[PDB]
């Protein structure tokens, strides 16, 4: 995250850390959607061009974290994946289209002041909140600067931008499974996700029922916080029918 701040304690209790067993290391962000399931970007697990193809075994899930680096002795819980599911039509070849994956935990986690799930949007909720101008919030332990790593979880509030402008800022082909967010060079406010923030949640708070909803997943971008550039996220509501599906077939 570029131009954000440290999160307050328990500000984002669905925030999950994707963690490598050896070298033990931060892979990506992700989010708690129930006591057994985690939501992240598919490219966090499968990205052939970087020779990336992680297995259930390659990792751990860290929930309830604040500190990037410390092992939060009575706060955080570490879990093991029972399985990984990637959107069958996720496109690593041309533009990270359908950048989405689900992870089923070996054992259901217990919620706490620091551990609590995010809601998935319904058609009406998405209908009304995914509007150009409306702000969302992103969190992650990622790069602070395009060129480093924070000590604590970072947060930023960013406005959704019109598809036209999103499309006109880049050479890459944008699909309906993506939305972009950031400020306009004239709006004079900064911030963005950045390398290492991948897989993290872009959430909105409903004004109707005052619940926090997850609308996007941190996907890709061009540099971090550059004028005329915007962060791109996986449009969670559009890939919902796929999510429903796998949960209904493989668990809970």
């Amino acid at each position: 995250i570029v131009e954000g701040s440290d999160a307050e304690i328990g500000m984002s209790p669905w925030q999950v850390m994707l963690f490598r067993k050896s070298p033990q290391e931060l892979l990506c962000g992700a989010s708690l959607i129930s006591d057994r399931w985690v939501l992240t970007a598919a490219h966090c697990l499968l990205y052939p061009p970087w020779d990336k193809n992680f297995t259930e075994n390659d990792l751990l899930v860290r929930i309830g974290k604040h500190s990037r680096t410390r092992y939060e002795r009575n706060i955080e819980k570490i879990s093991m994946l029972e399985k990984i599911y990637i959107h069958p039509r996720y496109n690593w070849r041309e533009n990270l289209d359908r950048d989405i994956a689900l992870m089923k935990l070996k054992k259901p986690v217990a919620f706490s002041d620091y551990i609590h799930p995010v809601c998935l949007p319904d058609r009406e909720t998405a209908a009304s909140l995914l509007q150009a101008g409306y702000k969302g919030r992103v969190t992650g332990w990622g790069n602070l600067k395009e060129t480093g790593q924070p000590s604590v979880l970072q947060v930023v509030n960013l406005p959704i931008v019109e598809r036209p402008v999103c499309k006109d800022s880049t050479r890459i082909r944008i699909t309906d499974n993506m939305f972009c967010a950031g400020y306009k060079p004239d709006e004079g406010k900064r911030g963005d996700a950045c390398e290492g923030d991948s897989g993290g949640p872009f959430v909105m708070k409903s004004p109707f029922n005052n619940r926090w909803y997850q609308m996007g997943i941190v996907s890709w971008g061009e540099g971090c916080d550059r004028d005329g550039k915007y962060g791109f996220y996986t449009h969670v509501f559009r890939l919902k029918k796929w999510i429903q599906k796998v949960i209904d077939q493989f668990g809970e």
């Binding site: 307050e8 304690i9 328990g10 500000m11 209790p13 708690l32 959607i33 129930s34 006591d35 919620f111 706490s112 002041d113 620091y114 609590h116 799930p117 995010v118 809601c119 998935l120 909140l129 101008g133 409306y134 702000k135 969302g136 919030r137 947060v155 509030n157 406005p159 909105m204 708070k205 409903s206 004004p207 005052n210 619940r211 926090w212 909803y213």
Partner: peptide, 29 residues
Amino acid sequence: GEADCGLRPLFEKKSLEDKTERELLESYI
């Protein structure tokens, strides 16, 4: 767990607000 979803134990549940959530709610015109 998604049922008590999106109500944070240290904010919503105690009816305390975080430092910038008001910026969000204000953008929803």
